Amino acid sequence: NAAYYQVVPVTANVYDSDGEKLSYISQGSVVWLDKDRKSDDKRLAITISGLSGYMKTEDLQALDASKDFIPYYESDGHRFYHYVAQNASIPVASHLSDMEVGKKYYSADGLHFDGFKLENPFLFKDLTEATNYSAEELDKVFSLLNINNSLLENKGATFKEAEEHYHINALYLLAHSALESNWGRSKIAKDKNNFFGITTFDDVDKGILGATKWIKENYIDRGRTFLGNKASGMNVEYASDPYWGEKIASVMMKINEKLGGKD
């Protein structure tokens, strides 16, 4: 058995030892062979984004570490990045003095490394905690990041109303909608009125409130109260992308930095 494998179908399921579905992951995702559990001809014991389970052998293609891309993490001396694909990165934390700049680090859960533990500032934050940011501050970020023709600009008051009503962090709501709609510039999102990529008040305001209600009832109220990864939080069920939670958290980080680090 190889050390790493890549997901073959559009999505594939991850199972427990008894064959019950635990989660699902996206095509091209790289999973780690887990040598501490038994793999056989039908299923491989694997780890992905915090989750340990089994995957069907026909769902996985063996990778060669010398030839193929293996995701890793690296610091530039200021920020630590997760490289999830050839050349593509997600900022996940500040640099720690424990990290050798330029060196590639590997982790099956994105938290525990060889020499240190990472505190991603938003990945495991309780999403029912309100943001410190005002409606007016949230609105400022579109200027500061040079985003234009966004249907989400001037929606700070809507996000804060959503936060007060449903008790879901407005910075998270802004981040989630920004990720799923290209900062409110997506034509698909406008035409479908679906800025969060779920399966006078205008349609955008109504969509934000409706999406927040949906997240509250289907995630928060069902015990999924933070972004997380494939082992826990919203990422277990919300998206096949095992690093969806990290992507949202990175958007929250970018917004927070630009607005002065109040959260």
PDB file of C-alpha atoms in Angstrom:
ATOM      1  CA  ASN A   1       0.000   0.000   0.000  1.00  0.00           C
ATOM      2  CA  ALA A   2       1.097   3.556  -0.855  1.00  0.00           C
ATOM      3  CA  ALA A   3       1.424   6.329   1.766  1.00  0.00           C
ATOM      4  CA  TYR A   4      -1.027   8.668  -0.013  1.00  0.00           C
ATOM      5  CA  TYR A   5      -4.110   8.220  -2.246  1.00  0.00           C
ATOM      6  CA  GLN A   6      -6.281  10.577  -4.284  1.00  0.00           C
ATOM      7  CA  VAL A   7     -10.079  10.432  -4.540  1.00  0.00           C
ATOM      8  CA  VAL A   8     -11.279   9.137  -7.934  1.00  0.00           C
ATOM      9  CA  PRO A   9     -15.058   9.791  -8.151  1.00  0.00           C
ATOM     10  CA  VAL A  10     -16.764  13.207  -7.950  1.00  0.00           C
ATOM     11  CA  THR A  11     -17.397  12.444  -4.292  1.00  0.00           C
ATOM     12  CA  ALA A  12     -16.544   9.429  -2.206  1.00  0.00           C
ATOM     13  CA  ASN A  13     -17.735   8.333   1.188  1.00  0.00           C
ATOM     14  CA  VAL A  14     -15.644   7.698   4.300  1.00  0.00           C
ATOM     15  CA  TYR A  15     -16.945   4.812   6.448  1.00  0.00           C
ATOM     16  CA  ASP A  16     -16.379   3.510   9.973  1.00  0.00           C
ATOM     17  CA  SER A  17     -15.165  -0.088  10.533  1.00  0.00           C
ATOM     18  CA  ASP A  18     -18.811  -1.328  10.514  1.00  0.00           C
ATOM     19  CA  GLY A  19     -19.564   0.275   7.100  1.00  0.00           C
ATOM     20  CA  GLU A  20     -21.639   3.229   8.369  1.00  0.00           C
ATOM     21  CA  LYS A  21     -21.087   6.507   6.480  1.00  0.00           C
ATOM     22  CA  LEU A  22     -19.109   9.108   8.470  1.00  0.00           C
ATOM     23  CA  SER A  23     -18.675  11.787   5.812  1.00  0.00           C
ATOM     24  CA  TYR A  24     -17.871  12.383   2.159  1.00  0.00           C
ATOM     25  CA  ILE A  25     -14.971  13.983   0.385  1.00  0.00           C
ATOM     26  CA  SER A  26     -14.288  15.569  -2.977  1.00  0.00           C
ATOM     27  CA  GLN A  27     -12.562  14.260  -6.117  1.00  0.00           C
ATOM     28  CA  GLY A  28      -8.824  14.884  -6.072  1.00  0.00           C
ATOM     29  CA  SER A  29      -8.615  15.040  -2.268  1.00  0.00           C
ATOM     30  CA  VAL A  30      -5.464  13.451  -0.911  1.00  0.00           C
ATOM     31  CA  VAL A  31      -5.896  11.037   1.941  1.00  0.00           C
ATOM     32  CA  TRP A  32      -3.233   9.407   4.116  1.00  0.00           C
ATOM     33  CA  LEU A  33      -2.924   5.658   4.564  1.00  0.00           C
ATOM     34  CA  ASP A  34      -3.293   4.822   8.257  1.00  0.00           C
ATOM     35  CA  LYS A  35      -0.913   1.958   9.092  1.00  0.00           C
ATOM     36  CA  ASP A  36      -2.272   1.599  12.655  1.00  0.00           C
ATOM     37  CA  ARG A  37      -5.507   0.071  11.297  1.00  0.00           C
ATOM     38  CA  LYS A  38      -6.028  -2.810   8.869  1.00  0.00           C
ATOM     39  CA  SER A  39      -6.571  -2.227   5.184  1.00  0.00           C
ATOM     40  CA  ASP A  40      -7.651  -5.130   2.970  1.00  0.00           C
ATOM     41  CA  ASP A  41      -8.548  -5.712  -0.708  1.00  0.00           C
ATOM     42  CA  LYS A  42     -11.955  -3.985  -0.399  1.00  0.00           C
ATOM     43  CA  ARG A  43     -11.173  -0.977   1.812  1.00  0.00           C
ATOM     44  CA  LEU A  44      -8.250   1.162   2.929  1.00  0.00           C
ATOM     45  CA  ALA A  45      -7.819   2.575   6.441  1.00  0.00           C
ATOM     46  CA  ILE A  46      -7.255   6.280   5.856  1.00  0.00           C
ATOM     47  CA  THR A  47      -7.128   9.716   7.463  1.00  0.00           C
ATOM     48  CA  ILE A  48      -8.363  12.980   5.940  1.00  0.00           C
ATOM     49  CA  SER A  49      -8.817  16.415   7.552  1.00  0.00           C
ATOM     50  CA  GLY A  50      -8.995  14.996  11.095  1.00  0.00           C
ATOM     51  CA  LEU A  51     -11.228  12.027  10.259  1.00  0.00           C
ATOM     52  CA  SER A  52     -10.056   8.395  10.560  1.00  0.00           C
ATOM     53  CA  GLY A  53     -12.108   5.810   8.670  1.00  0.00           C
ATOM     54  CA  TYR A  54     -12.197   3.486   5.681  1.00  0.00           C
ATOM     55  CA  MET A  55     -12.640   4.062   1.986  1.00  0.00           C
ATOM     56  CA  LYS A  56     -13.410   1.679  -0.839  1.00  0.00           C
ATOM     57  CA  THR A  57     -10.320   0.764  -2.910  1.00  0.00           C
ATOM     58  CA  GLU A  58     -12.007   1.666  -6.232  1.00  0.00           C
ATOM     59  CA  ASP A  59     -12.559   5.201  -4.864  1.00  0.00           C
ATOM     60  CA  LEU A  60      -8.795   5.747  -4.380  1.00  0.00           C
ATOM     61  CA  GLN A  61      -5.765   6.061  -6.679  1.00  0.00           C
ATOM     62  CA  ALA A  62      -2.297   5.488  -5.173  1.00  0.00           C
ATOM     63  CA  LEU A  63       0.009   8.491  -5.435  1.00  0.00           C
ATOM     64  CA  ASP A  64       3.779   8.561  -5.705  1.00  0.00           C
ATOM     65  CA  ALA A  65       5.139  11.235  -3.345  1.00  0.00           C
ATOM     66  CA  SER A  66       8.145  11.947  -5.613  1.00  0.00           C
ATOM     67  CA  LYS A  67       5.866  12.611  -8.625  1.00  0.00           C
ATOM     68  CA  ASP A  68       2.424  13.690  -7.336  1.00  0.00           C
ATOM     69  CA  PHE A  69       1.300  16.655  -5.193  1.00  0.00           C
ATOM     70  CA  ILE A  70       1.050  15.986  -1.463  1.00  0.00           C
ATOM     71  CA  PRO A  71      -0.597  18.818   0.529  1.00  0.00           C
ATOM     72  CA  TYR A  72       1.618  20.459   3.120  1.00  0.00           C
ATOM     73  CA  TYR A  73       1.862  23.497   5.320  1.00  0.00           C
ATOM     74  CA  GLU A  74       4.560  26.178   5.311  1.00  0.00           C
ATOM     75  CA  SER A  75       5.433  29.464   6.978  1.00  0.00           C
ATOM     76  CA  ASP A  76       6.771  32.583   5.253  1.00  0.00           C
ATOM     77  CA  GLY A  77       7.811  33.967   8.676  1.00  0.00           C
ATOM     78  CA  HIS A  78       4.548  35.892   9.096  1.00  0.00           C
ATOM     79  CA  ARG A  79       1.763  33.494   8.182  1.00  0.00           C
ATOM     80  CA  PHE A  80       1.384  29.716   8.000  1.00  0.00           C
ATOM     81  CA  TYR A  81      -0.302  28.431   4.841  1.00  0.00           C
ATOM     82  CA  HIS A  82      -1.933  25.206   3.852  1.00  0.00           C
ATOM     83  CA  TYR A  83      -0.985  24.242   0.292  1.00  0.00           C
ATOM     84  CA  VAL A  84      -3.997  22.217  -0.818  1.00  0.00           C
ATOM     85  CA  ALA A  85      -3.098  21.968  -4.494  1.00  0.00           C
ATOM     86  CA  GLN A  86      -0.205  22.723  -6.818  1.00  0.00           C
ATOM     87  CA  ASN A  87       0.587  26.380  -6.089  1.00  0.00           C
ATOM     88  CA  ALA A  88      -2.744  27.049  -4.273  1.00  0.00           C
ATOM     89  CA  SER A  89      -2.700  28.113  -0.617  1.00  0.00           C
ATOM     90  CA  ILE A  90      -4.973  28.965   2.307  1.00  0.00           C
ATOM     91  CA  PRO A  91      -3.642  31.181   5.115  1.00  0.00           C
ATOM     92  CA  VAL A  92      -4.406  29.292   8.366  1.00  0.00           C
ATOM     93  CA  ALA A  93      -2.434  30.949  11.190  1.00  0.00           C
ATOM     94  CA  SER A  94       0.270  33.345  12.272  1.00  0.00           C
ATOM     95  CA  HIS A  95       3.891  32.316  12.192  1.00  0.00           C
ATOM     96  CA  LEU A  96       5.156  30.664  15.400  1.00  0.00           C
ATOM     97  CA  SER A  97       8.793  30.883  16.458  1.00  0.00           C
ATOM     98  CA  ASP A  98       8.664  27.029  16.586  1.00  0.00           C
ATOM     99  CA  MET A  99       8.347  26.956  12.769  1.00  0.00           C
ATOM    100  CA  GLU A 100      11.296  26.833  10.421  1.00  0.00           C
ATOM    101  CA  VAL A 101      10.580  29.317   7.640  1.00  0.00           C
ATOM    102  CA  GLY A 102      10.377  27.680   4.193  1.00  0.00           C
ATOM    103  CA  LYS A 103      10.176  24.137   5.531  1.00  0.00           C
ATOM    104  CA  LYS A 104       7.302  21.866   4.461  1.00  0.00           C
ATOM    105  CA  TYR A 105       5.250  20.456   7.322  1.00  0.00           C
ATOM    106  CA  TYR A 106       2.719  17.590   7.169  1.00  0.00           C
ATOM    107  CA  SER A 107      -0.345  16.955   9.350  1.00  0.00           C
ATOM    108  CA  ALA A 108      -3.355  14.625   9.011  1.00  0.00           C
ATOM    109  CA  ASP A 109      -5.577  16.955  11.062  1.00  0.00           C
ATOM    110  CA  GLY A 110      -4.147  20.429  10.285  1.00  0.00           C
ATOM    111  CA  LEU A 111      -3.696  21.134  14.015  1.00  0.00           C
ATOM    112  CA  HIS A 112      -1.048  18.776  15.402  1.00  0.00           C
ATOM    113  CA  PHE A 113       2.388  19.032  13.876  1.00  0.00           C
ATOM    114  CA  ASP A 114       5.899  17.837  14.529  1.00  0.00           C
ATOM    115  CA  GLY A 115       7.033  20.354  17.125  1.00  0.00           C
ATOM    116  CA  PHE A 116       3.898  22.470  17.556  1.00  0.00           C
ATOM    117  CA  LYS A 117       0.158  22.794  17.619  1.00  0.00           C
ATOM    118  CA  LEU A 118      -1.636  25.316  15.475  1.00  0.00           C
ATOM    119  CA  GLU A 119      -4.375  27.578  16.734  1.00  0.00           C
ATOM    120  CA  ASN A 120      -6.403  28.559  13.709  1.00  0.00           C
ATOM    121  CA  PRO A 121      -8.180  31.699  15.067  1.00  0.00           C
ATOM    122  CA  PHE A 122     -11.649  30.852  13.666  1.00  0.00           C
ATOM    123  CA  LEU A 123     -11.751  27.200  12.662  1.00  0.00           C
ATOM    124  CA  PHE A 124     -13.089  26.001  16.007  1.00  0.00           C
ATOM    125  CA  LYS A 125     -14.683  29.229  17.240  1.00  0.00           C
ATOM    126  CA  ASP A 126     -18.227  28.872  18.569  1.00  0.00           C
ATOM    127  CA  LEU A 127     -20.296  30.469  15.817  1.00  0.00           C
ATOM    128  CA  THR A 128     -23.066  31.541  18.204  1.00  0.00           C
ATOM    129  CA  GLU A 129     -20.691  34.212  19.662  1.00  0.00           C
ATOM    130  CA  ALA A 130     -21.481  37.585  18.118  1.00  0.00           C
ATOM    131  CA  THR A 131     -18.844  39.619  16.273  1.00  0.00           C
ATOM    132  CA  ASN A 132     -17.472  42.816  17.839  1.00  0.00           C
ATOM    133  CA  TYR A 133     -17.802  44.497  14.468  1.00  0.00           C
ATOM    134  CA  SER A 134     -20.619  46.957  13.771  1.00  0.00           C
ATOM    135  CA  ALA A 135     -22.772  46.982  10.647  1.00  0.00           C
ATOM    136  CA  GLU A 136     -20.787  50.023   9.526  1.00  0.00           C
ATOM    137  CA  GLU A 137     -17.401  48.309   9.995  1.00  0.00           C
ATOM    138  CA  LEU A 138     -18.471  45.195   8.037  1.00  0.00           C
ATOM    139  CA  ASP A 139     -19.518  47.481   5.144  1.00  0.00           C
ATOM    140  CA  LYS A 140     -16.035  49.069   5.000  1.00  0.00           C
ATOM    141  CA  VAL A 141     -14.250  45.887   3.972  1.00  0.00           C
ATOM    142  CA  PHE A 142     -15.418  46.005   0.345  1.00  0.00           C
ATOM    143  CA  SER A 143     -13.564  49.282  -0.190  1.00  0.00           C
ATOM    144  CA  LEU A 144     -10.495  48.049   1.702  1.00  0.00           C
ATOM    145  CA  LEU A 145     -10.207  44.899  -0.452  1.00  0.00           C
ATOM    146  CA  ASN A 146     -11.068  46.764  -3.672  1.00  0.00           C
ATOM    147  CA  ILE A 147     -14.182  44.718  -4.334  1.00  0.00           C
ATOM    148  CA  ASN A 148     -16.638  46.342  -6.731  1.00  0.00           C
ATOM    149  CA  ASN A 149     -20.129  45.754  -8.062  1.00  0.00           C
ATOM    150  CA  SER A 150     -20.824  43.450  -5.101  1.00  0.00           C
ATOM    151  CA  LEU A 151     -24.429  42.775  -4.165  1.00  0.00           C
ATOM    152  CA  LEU A 152     -23.155  42.248  -0.584  1.00  0.00           C
ATOM    153  CA  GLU A 153     -21.930  45.800  -0.123  1.00  0.00           C
ATOM    154  CA  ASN A 154     -24.132  47.825   2.224  1.00  0.00           C
ATOM    155  CA  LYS A 155     -25.403  44.547   3.761  1.00  0.00           C
ATOM    156  CA  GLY A 156     -23.688  45.016   7.125  1.00  0.00           C
ATOM    157  CA  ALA A 157     -26.989  45.968   8.770  1.00  0.00           C
ATOM    158  CA  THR A 158     -28.581  42.837   7.315  1.00  0.00           C
ATOM    159  CA  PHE A 159     -25.795  40.593   8.620  1.00  0.00           C
ATOM    160  CA  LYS A 160     -26.064  42.197  12.070  1.00  0.00           C
ATOM    161  CA  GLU A 161     -29.885  41.789  12.085  1.00  0.00           C
ATOM    162  CA  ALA A 162     -29.348  38.159  11.114  1.00  0.00           C
ATOM    163  CA  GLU A 163     -26.838  37.790  13.949  1.00  0.00           C
ATOM    164  CA  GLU A 164     -29.178  39.290  16.554  1.00  0.00           C
ATOM    165  CA  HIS A 165     -32.208  37.321  15.395  1.00  0.00           C
ATOM    166  CA  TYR A 166     -30.600  33.900  14.905  1.00  0.00           C
ATOM    167  CA  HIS A 167     -27.517  34.168  17.187  1.00  0.00           C
ATOM    168  CA  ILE A 168     -24.986  33.420  14.474  1.00  0.00           C
ATOM    169  CA  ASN A 169     -21.746  35.389  14.163  1.00  0.00           C
ATOM    170  CA  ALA A 170     -22.120  38.078  11.480  1.00  0.00           C
ATOM    171  CA  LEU A 171     -18.445  37.950  10.487  1.00  0.00           C
ATOM    172  CA  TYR A 172     -18.912  34.240   9.775  1.00  0.00           C
ATOM    173  CA  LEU A 173     -22.066  34.990   7.705  1.00  0.00           C
ATOM    174  CA  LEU A 174     -20.194  37.604   5.703  1.00  0.00           C
ATOM    175  CA  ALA A 175     -17.280  35.190   5.156  1.00  0.00           C
ATOM    176  CA  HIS A 176     -19.495  32.276   4.169  1.00  0.00           C
ATOM    177  CA  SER A 177     -21.461  34.357   1.682  1.00  0.00           C
ATOM    178  CA  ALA A 178     -18.218  35.929   0.359  1.00  0.00           C
ATOM    179  CA  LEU A 179     -16.672  32.489  -0.263  1.00  0.00           C
ATOM    180  CA  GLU A 180     -19.704  30.955  -1.933  1.00  0.00           C
ATOM    181  CA  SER A 181     -20.556  33.983  -4.155  1.00  0.00           C
ATOM    182  CA  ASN A 182     -17.127  35.483  -4.994  1.00  0.00           C
ATOM    183  CA  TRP A 183     -17.650  38.421  -2.624  1.00  0.00           C
ATOM    184  CA  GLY A 184     -21.165  38.966  -3.987  1.00  0.00           C
ATOM    185  CA  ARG A 185     -20.004  39.299  -7.613  1.00  0.00           C
ATOM    186  CA  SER A 186     -21.218  35.887  -8.810  1.00  0.00           C
ATOM    187  CA  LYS A 187     -23.925  36.046 -11.523  1.00  0.00           C
ATOM    188  CA  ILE A 188     -25.055  32.496 -10.635  1.00  0.00           C
ATOM    189  CA  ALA A 189     -25.547  33.682  -7.028  1.00  0.00           C
ATOM    190  CA  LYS A 190     -27.550  36.759  -8.102  1.00  0.00           C
ATOM    191  CA  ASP A 191     -29.734  34.864 -10.616  1.00  0.00           C
ATOM    192  CA  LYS A 192     -30.337  31.970  -8.157  1.00  0.00           C
ATOM    193  CA  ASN A 193     -30.463  34.328  -5.128  1.00  0.00           C
ATOM    194  CA  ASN A 194     -28.206  31.841  -3.332  1.00  0.00           C
ATOM    195  CA  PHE A 195     -25.197  33.641  -1.856  1.00  0.00           C
ATOM    196  CA  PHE A 196     -24.357  30.917   0.714  1.00  0.00           C
ATOM    197  CA  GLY A 197     -24.460  28.002  -1.752  1.00  0.00           C
ATOM    198  CA  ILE A 198     -27.214  26.119   0.051  1.00  0.00           C
ATOM    199  CA  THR A 199     -28.056  22.981  -2.010  1.00  0.00           C
ATOM    200  CA  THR A 200     -36.519  48.316   2.124  1.00  0.00           C
ATOM    201  CA  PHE A 201     -35.670  44.604   2.130  1.00  0.00           C
ATOM    202  CA  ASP A 202     -34.545  43.328  -1.281  1.00  0.00           C
ATOM    203  CA  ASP A 203     -34.029  39.741  -2.474  1.00  0.00           C
ATOM    204  CA  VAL A 204     -30.417  39.788  -1.255  1.00  0.00           C
ATOM    205  CA  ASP A 205     -31.487  40.817   2.283  1.00  0.00           C
ATOM    206  CA  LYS A 206     -34.162  38.166   2.273  1.00  0.00           C
ATOM    207  CA  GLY A 207     -31.633  35.592   1.086  1.00  0.00           C
ATOM    208  CA  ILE A 208     -29.193  36.461   3.873  1.00  0.00           C
ATOM    209  CA  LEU A 209     -31.884  36.129   6.534  1.00  0.00           C
ATOM    210  CA  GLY A 210     -33.226  32.925   4.972  1.00  0.00           C
ATOM    211  CA  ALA A 211     -29.746  31.389   4.751  1.00  0.00           C
ATOM    212  CA  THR A 212     -28.968  32.300   8.359  1.00  0.00           C
ATOM    213  CA  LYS A 213     -32.233  30.676   9.502  1.00  0.00           C
ATOM    214  CA  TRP A 214     -31.261  27.561   7.539  1.00  0.00           C
ATOM    215  CA  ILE A 215     -27.773  27.407   9.031  1.00  0.00           C
ATOM    216  CA  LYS A 216     -29.233  27.904  12.530  1.00  0.00           C
ATOM    217  CA  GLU A 217     -31.782  25.132  12.208  1.00  0.00           C
ATOM    218  CA  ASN A 218     -29.739  22.596  10.241  1.00  0.00           C
ATOM    219  CA  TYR A 219     -26.310  23.078  11.794  1.00  0.00           C
ATOM    220  CA  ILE A 220     -26.185  25.143  14.981  1.00  0.00           C
ATOM    221  CA  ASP A 221     -29.303  23.605  16.543  1.00  0.00           C
ATOM    222  CA  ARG A 222     -28.115  20.133  15.596  1.00  0.00           C
ATOM    223  CA  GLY A 223     -24.813  20.391  17.445  1.00  0.00           C
ATOM    224  CA  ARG A 224     -22.618  21.698  14.593  1.00  0.00           C
ATOM    225  CA  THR A 225     -21.538  24.991  16.166  1.00  0.00           C
ATOM    226  CA  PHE A 226     -18.145  25.676  14.511  1.00  0.00           C
ATOM    227  CA  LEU A 227     -16.568  25.296  11.078  1.00  0.00           C
ATOM    228  CA  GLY A 228     -14.225  22.420  11.827  1.00  0.00           C
ATOM    229  CA  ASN A 229     -13.003  19.695   9.503  1.00  0.00           C
ATOM    230  CA  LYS A 230     -14.065  16.198   8.441  1.00  0.00           C
ATOM    231  CA  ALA A 231     -14.037  14.910  12.054  1.00  0.00           C
ATOM    232  CA  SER A 232     -16.276  17.568  13.595  1.00  0.00           C
ATOM    233  CA  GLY A 233     -18.192  20.791  13.004  1.00  0.00           C
ATOM    234  CA  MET A 234     -20.102  22.010   9.950  1.00  0.00           C
ATOM    235  CA  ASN A 235     -17.544  20.739   7.454  1.00  0.00           C
ATOM    236  CA  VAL A 236     -18.494  17.129   8.182  1.00  0.00           C
ATOM    237  CA  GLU A 237     -21.792  17.448   6.298  1.00  0.00           C
ATOM    238  CA  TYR A 238     -21.760  20.859   4.669  1.00  0.00           C
ATOM    239  CA  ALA A 239     -19.247  20.377   1.851  1.00  0.00           C
ATOM    240  CA  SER A 240     -17.249  17.594   0.235  1.00  0.00           C
ATOM    241  CA  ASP A 241     -14.198  19.902   0.295  1.00  0.00           C
ATOM    242  CA  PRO A 242     -12.280  18.687   3.387  1.00  0.00           C
ATOM    243  CA  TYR A 243     -10.820  22.185   3.841  1.00  0.00           C
ATOM    244  CA  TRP A 244     -14.029  24.209   3.414  1.00  0.00           C
ATOM    245  CA  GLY A 245     -13.853  25.134   7.104  1.00  0.00           C
ATOM    246  CA  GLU A 246     -10.276  26.362   6.685  1.00  0.00           C
ATOM    247  CA  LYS A 247     -11.279  28.418   3.627  1.00  0.00           C
ATOM    248  CA  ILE A 248     -14.097  30.160   5.530  1.00  0.00           C
ATOM    249  CA  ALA A 249     -11.807  30.722   8.525  1.00  0.00           C
ATOM    250  CA  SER A 250      -9.175  32.292   6.210  1.00  0.00           C
ATOM    251  CA  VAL A 251     -11.757  34.717   4.816  1.00  0.00           C
ATOM    252  CA  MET A 252     -12.734  35.590   8.429  1.00  0.00           C
ATOM    253  CA  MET A 253      -9.023  36.172   9.134  1.00  0.00           C
ATOM    254  CA  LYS A 254      -8.579  38.413   6.099  1.00  0.00           C
ATOM    255  CA  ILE A 255     -11.637  40.518   7.001  1.00  0.00           C
ATOM    256  CA  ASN A 256     -10.638  40.703  10.636  1.00  0.00           C
ATOM    257  CA  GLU A 257      -7.098  41.839   9.810  1.00  0.00           C
ATOM    258  CA  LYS A 258      -8.364  44.548   7.464  1.00  0.00           C
ATOM    259  CA  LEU A 259     -10.897  45.881  10.002  1.00  0.00           C
ATOM    260  CA  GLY A 260      -8.334  46.073  12.845  1.00  0.00           C
ATOM    261  CA  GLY A 261      -8.275  42.741  14.675  1.00  0.00           C
ATOM    262  CA  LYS A 262     -11.266  43.354  16.931  1.00  0.00           C
ATOM    263  CA  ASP A 263     -12.376  39.695  16.956  1.00  0.00           C
TER     264      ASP A 263
END
